[PDB]
Amino acid sequence: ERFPADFVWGAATAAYQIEGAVREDGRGVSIWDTFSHTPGKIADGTTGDVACDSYHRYGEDIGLLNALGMNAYRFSIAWPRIVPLGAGPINQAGLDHYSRMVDALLGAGLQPFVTLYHWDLPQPLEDRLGWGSRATATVFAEYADIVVRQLGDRVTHWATLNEPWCSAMLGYYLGVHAPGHTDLKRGLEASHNLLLGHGLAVQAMRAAAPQPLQIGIVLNLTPTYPASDSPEDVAAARRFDGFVNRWFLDPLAGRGYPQDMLDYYGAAAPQANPEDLTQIAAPLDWLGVNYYERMRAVDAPDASLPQAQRLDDPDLPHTADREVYPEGLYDILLRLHNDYPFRPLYITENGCALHDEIAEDGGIHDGQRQAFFEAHLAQLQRALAAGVPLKGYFAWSLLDNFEWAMGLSMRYGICYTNFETLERRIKDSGYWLRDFIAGQ
Prior knowledge:
Elements lengths: L7 E5 L2 H4 L12 H6 L17 H14 L4 E5 L2 H4 L9 H16 L3 E7 L5 H4 L7 H18 L5 E6 L1 H10 L10 H25 L5 E7 L3 E3 L4 H22 L6 H7 L8 H7 L5 E5 L4 E5 L8 E3 L16 H13 L5 E5 L17 H19 L4 E7 L18 E3 L6 E3 L1 H12 L1
Parallel strand pairs: 1-2, 1-11, 2-3, 3-4, 4-5, 5-7, 6-8, 7-10, 10-11
Antiparallel strand pairs: 8-9, 12-13
Helix pairs in contact: 7-9, 8-9, 9-12, 13-14, 14-15
């Protein structure tokens, strides 16, 4: 029942989801500014123009982290504030802002865990094909160099990318995220250039750092299970597992792209010369796992690639947007520990969305979210007992925020955000986490 004494306990956010202040202090335009201002792309007509106003109110966010007794904060730096043209001169005012914020976090006893790329690509780079162009990978590494030079005296733990599968597949193939393209070949090309950017950035950061850094990447991983043992359903599960998980894990581990997926994608697969694969496999100091859900797969030959459909289980709990399956967290961690070389591991996101409301008493009675945390934390204890080298846990999210294509309508916070007044309030599940952590 006890976690290690030095375990990292945090909450996580991303810059475009919380900051607002989209035109302040020289910030450039990102693909998400363009996309959210495009009619019909966001479910509720909202944008990130204001969001939680955390560019101005980060002190309130620090107050919440302190009230919860956390010891770390995972947040992202907005590339458009640092290099507004994507490739070009730096904006010193952007770096100064994050320097102050880091000092405020350290002054409060909170370790910063910084994500460099959490989806807010500068629009000028997208005008030159975005992640469809190798040049974007090069200039991403330049941005990483710039930020580490100025903040790496104080921040040791850095992640290059958050969820490249989403950036590539939701942004360039399925069209539901920015920039909103709908082309498989472009999505797979983007996946390669994201991984190449990661590898180039790791090398650049190590050369630029004023002290040794602990560099990782953050992947969303979905444990996949066949709905039956038929050859068709087992193959569907392998395809889905390749599509989401192995496509990214294998090249990072020095194993190339998985051959079964290369065969399946055929001519749409990217051209990956061996020089690139060597860069992609740059050694990492940790891996971040974002865990939300499993996939129970059935063969779906008429469906779109990867021709696998989810088989809902109505007997399991559901949140506002997902099925709850805590045991999948144990399964995926054991798989990583046994089958892949990455260690140590952090859970860089885990959380749930509910239709939260303020009750008459003023609290938010989010019992399902409390139960969600309790069940997932129990699975971490099981993983630790099996020898998995897990070093921390970050709840998604510190506060309700702009949840991408769902807008302000999907509340994932442990703190409730009133989007009209910008007041934050701790939900009951946040008080449960506070008290659980204090007991550790």
